[PDB]
Design a protein around this motif. Sequence first.
Motif, mmCIF file in Angstrom:
data_model
loop_
_atom_site.group_PDB
_atom_site.id
_atom_site.type_symbol
_atom_site.label_atom_id
_atom_site.label_comp_id
_atom_site.label_asym_id
_atom_site.label_seq_id
_atom_site.Cartn_x
_atom_site.Cartn_y
_atom_site.Cartn_z
ATOM 1 N N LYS A 31 1.018 -1.102 0.063
ATOM 2 C CA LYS A 31 0.013 -0.055 0.045
ATOM 3 C C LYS A 31 0.900 1.173 -0.055
ATOM 4 C CE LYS A 31 -4.294 -1.840 2.019
ATOM 5 N NZ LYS A 31 -3.953 -2.876 3.036
ATOM 6 N N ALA A 32 1.800 1.182 0.884
ATOM 7 C CA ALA A 32 2.753 2.367 0.801
ATOM 8 C C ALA A 32 3.580 2.679 -0.611
ATOM 9 C CB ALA A 32 4.068 2.296 1.786
ATOM 10 N N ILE A 33 3.959 1.464 -1.302
ATOM 11 C CA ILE A 33 4.538 1.745 -2.633
ATOM 12 C C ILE A 33 3.418 2.168 -3.461
ATOM 13 C CG2 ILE A 33 5.695 0.503 -4.295
ATOM 14 C CD1 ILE A 33 6.517 -1.630 -2.430
ATOM 15 N N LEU B 28 -1.025 0.185 14.701
ATOM 16 C CA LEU B 28 -1.164 1.693 14.432
ATOM 17 C C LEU B 28 -1.089 1.865 12.999
ATOM 18 C CD1 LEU B 28 1.210 3.451 17.121
ATOM 19 C CD2 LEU B 28 -1.302 2.959 17.155
ATOM 20 N N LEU B 29 -0.095 0.973 12.300
ATOM 21 C CA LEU B 29 -0.085 1.315 10.919
ATOM 22 C C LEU B 29 -1.282 0.919 10.070
ATOM 23 C CD1 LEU B 29 3.514 -0.331 10.444
ATOM 24 C CD2 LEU B 29 2.913 2.308 9.906
ATOM 25 N N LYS B 30 -2.162 -0.101 10.467
ATOM 26 C CA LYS B 30 -3.455 -0.238 10.179
ATOM 27 C C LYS B 30 -4.328 1.027 10.167
ATOM 28 C CE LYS B 30 -3.893 -5.210 10.596
ATOM 29 N NZ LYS B 30 -4.574 -6.282 11.647
ATOM 30 N N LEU C 19 11.335 -8.719 11.499
ATOM 31 C CA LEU C 19 10.092 -8.020 11.329
ATOM 32 C C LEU C 19 10.203 -6.876 11.924
ATOM 33 C CD1 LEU C 19 7.123 -10.824 12.293
ATOM 34 C CD2 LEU C 19 7.428 -9.236 10.441
ATOM 35 N N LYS C 20 10.638 -6.514 13.085
ATOM 36 C CA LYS C 20 10.729 -5.318 13.718
ATOM 37 C C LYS C 20 11.607 -4.244 12.780
ATOM 38 C CE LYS C 20 12.116 -2.686 17.851
ATOM 39 N NZ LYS C 20 13.125 -2.211 16.907
ATOM 40 N N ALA C 21 12.740 -4.816 12.358
ATOM 41 C CA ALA C 21 13.414 -3.713 11.335
ATOM 42 C C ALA C 21 12.546 -3.582 10.198
ATOM 43 C CB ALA C 21 14.790 -4.572 10.746
ATOM 44 N N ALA C 22 11.703 -4.190 9.702
ATOM 45 C CA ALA C 22 10.787 -3.952 8.673
ATOM 46 C C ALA C 22 9.850 -3.036 9.154
ATOM 47 C CB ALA C 22 10.075 -5.128 8.088
ATOM 48 N N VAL C 23 9.121 -3.301 10.280
ATOM 49 C CA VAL C 23 7.980 -2.561 10.693
ATOM 50 C C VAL C 23 8.615 -1.027 11.139
ATOM 51 C CG1 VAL C 23 6.757 -2.193 12.805
ATOM 52 C CG2 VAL C 23 6.366 -4.230 11.530
ATOM 53 N N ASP C 24 9.519 -0.931 11.782
ATOM 54 C CA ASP C 24 10.143 0.347 12.090
ATOM 55 C C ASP C 24 10.596 1.094 10.854
ATOM 56 O OD1 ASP C 24 9.745 -0.473 14.688
ATOM 57 O OD2 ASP C 24 11.946 -0.271 15.488
ATOM 58 N N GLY C 25 11.272 0.475 9.915
ATOM 59 C CA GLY C 25 11.456 1.090 8.873
ATOM 60 C C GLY C 25 10.214 1.757 8.068
ATOM 61 N N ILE C 30 6.847 6.592 6.162
ATOM 62 C CA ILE C 30 5.613 7.345 5.916
ATOM 63 C C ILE C 30 5.315 8.072 7.254
ATOM 64 C CG2 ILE C 30 4.670 5.666 4.008
ATOM 65 C CD1 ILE C 30 3.627 3.700 6.131
ATOM 66 N N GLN C 31 5.400 9.288 7.305
ATOM 67 C CA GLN C 31 5.391 9.985 8.459
ATOM 68 C C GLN C 31 4.865 11.479 8.110
ATOM 69 O OE1 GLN C 31 8.613 9.826 11.276
ATOM 70 N NE2 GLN C 31 7.455 9.928 13.079
ATOM 71 N N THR C 32 4.404 11.960 9.112
ATOM 72 C CA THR C 32 3.799 13.391 8.874
ATOM 73 C C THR C 32 2.844 13.469 7.643
ATOM 74 O OG1 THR C 32 5.649 14.777 9.707
ATOM 75 C CG2 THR C 32 4.124 15.854 8.222
#
Lengths: 67, 71, 32
Positions: A31-33, B28-30, C19-25, C30-32
């Motif tokens: 979705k981001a892509i 949160l991302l959802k 998974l955490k590396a991906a989720v945090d990445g 995608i912010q603000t």
Amino acid sequence: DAVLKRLEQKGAEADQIIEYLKQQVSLLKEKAILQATLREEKKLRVENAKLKKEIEELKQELIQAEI
Amino acid sequence: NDAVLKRLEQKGAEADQIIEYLKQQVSLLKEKAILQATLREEKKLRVENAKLKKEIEELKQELIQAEIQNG
Amino acid sequence: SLQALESRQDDILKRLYELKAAVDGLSKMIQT
């Protein structure tokens, strides 16, 4: 015995949870892509318009030099 | 038992933390994705409902003209 | 058996941190 039987029971469902959570993150990343690719195609379409407009502007400006 | 059972708890508990953390971050991302979707679903409804109203007034305005000319 | 549990749990942890590396990445870009 009673500890290791549950220590492998949760460690088995945790592999299912990692696969579940990995699905969601894949879904969210795509979705981001998609959001990124769409606005980039839009800018590239605007740019493509300005470039062809400027190419032809330079073409006529080349004829005043021919004078 | 042994001190291996010790750090098999330290590893089994450490995983339980990351699982929790990951569920919270995916949820949160959802919500971001739900928010972005609902926000777009607003503007389409705002725009469409503005067109529907513009047609209601124009239907209403000609219902008066038809009532006068026939009266 | 007990030699295989700790290797299994070692993988789970390695995968959980990936998974955490991906989720945090994702949370960064995608912010603000």
